[PDB]
Design a protein around this ligand. Structure first.
Ligand SMILES: [Cl-]
Ligand SMILES: [K+]
Length: 382
């Protein structure tokens, strides 16, 4: 049997390397890889499905999963998963599992994951009289610390993050709303408004740069590495550069909660495996995904990517700060929540982006902005 697999993974990233190993097996299945190019995974992929030309297997960005699953494009793998001795749903973090779920059925298997958390400069904490062993755990503590850490004389903002008018702004904002008891289907609760007002306060009180509105997570975190922001909300992808560039002692803690007993959340990036529904070789496609999952234990070591799984430890990385950071990130992943899952996620995300921009620019109040977003979202998902 010959299978086809499409992914954005580059030559040194997991998919093509896993494919080479799978093909080397004595198992009568062979996979041919197509490397998808930037920004095309979704467009090319539902073009291909509509014309009967989809691959057998795809690695799809998690917020896109529900669109394919709800429209019949992905194979229902519920029973296959149940029978598998390799793929066990209890191994996975809850958020990634939810992203492959539609209508009480599994339509894929998580491939990898990431999240965001709160980096902090322990040396600037000490200079401000803050105990570096006790980083902020609530939104109020976070704002208090950001104030104490802001230092115009030395061009330091207390915090950096991203509210960019792209997917990153929604990615960063949604967990705050979720911790306050809101969802994408209900994004204008007074709790969600409090989240957005908190962001507005950070900007208006000069505790976060105005460039928060236009800057990527990566570019925001560069300012933390340079010592111009005392805290940063970003992901595990930052660590190696931070080790090279940040000339200070630093730690990482979970994204703070609005009140001590509030449910935790954070953002959730990266991809899922899926089988296209008209594959002529469903059993063999599933066996390939089982093989990939069986190697999740080696993913971080080999590729520097985190499995979507709670049963796999992060191996020692050779650096103590990196180990501690990743300890926090894997704890955070217990609480990471998906965007959606919604077949109309792109439209919904744009509505939320427009609300963030409208509020933080002062064009609309936070409540007026989120009321407008909720109205748009109710047309398409509820
Ligand atoms: Cl097809
Ligand atoms: K199973």
């Amino acid at each position: 049997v010959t299978l086809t697999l499409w992914s954005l993974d580059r030559d040194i990233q997991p998919a093509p390397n896993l494919i080479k190993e799978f093909n080397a097996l004595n198992n009568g299945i062979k996979i041919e890889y197509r490397q998808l190019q930037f920004d095309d995974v979704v467009s090319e992929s539902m073009r291909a499905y509509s014309t009967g030309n989809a691959p057998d297997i795809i690695a799809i960005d998690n917020p896109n999963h529900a669109m394919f699953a709800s429209r019949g494009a992905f194979l229902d793998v519920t029973d296959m998963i149940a029978k598998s001795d390799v793929i066990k749903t209890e191994n996975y973090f809850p958020g990634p599992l939810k992203s492959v779920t539609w209508d009480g059925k599994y339509f894929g298997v998580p491939k990898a994951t990431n999240t965001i958390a709160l980096y902090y400069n322990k040396d600037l904490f000490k200079a401000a009289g803050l105990d570096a062993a006790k980083p902020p755990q609530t939104w109020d503590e976070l704002v208090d610390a950001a104030r104490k850490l802001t230092n115009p004389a030395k061009n330091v903002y207390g915090i950096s993050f991203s509210a960019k008018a792209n997917e990153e702004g929604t990615f960063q904002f949604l967990p705050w709303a979720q911790m306050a008891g809101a969802t994408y289907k209900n994004i204008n609760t007074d709790g969600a408004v409090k989240a957005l007002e908190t962001w507005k306060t950070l900007l208006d009180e000069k505790l976060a740069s105005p460039d928060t509105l236009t800057r990527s997570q990566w570019d925001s975190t560069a300012t933390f590495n340079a010592g111009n922001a005392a805290m940063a909300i970003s992901g595990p992808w930052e660590i190696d550069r931070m080790l090279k560039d940040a000339k200070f002692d630093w730690g990482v803690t979970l994204l703070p909660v609005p009140t001590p007993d509030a449910p935790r959340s954070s953002a959730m990036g990266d991809y899922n495996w899926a089988i296209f529904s008209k594959t002529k070789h469903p059993a063999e496609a599933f066996k390939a995904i089982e093989f990939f999952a069986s190697k999740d234990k080696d993913m971080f070591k080999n590729f520097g990517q985190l499995p979507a799984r709670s049963d796999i430890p992060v191996p020692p990385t050779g650096n103590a700060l990196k180990d501690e950071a990743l300890k926090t990130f894997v704890e955070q992943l217990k609480y990471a929540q998906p965007r959606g899952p919604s077949p109309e996620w792109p439209k919904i995300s744009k509505a939320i982006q427009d609300a963030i921009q409208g509020a933080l620019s002062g064009q609309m109040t936070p409540k007026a902005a989120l009321d407008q977003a909720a109205e748009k979202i109710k047309l398409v998902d509820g």
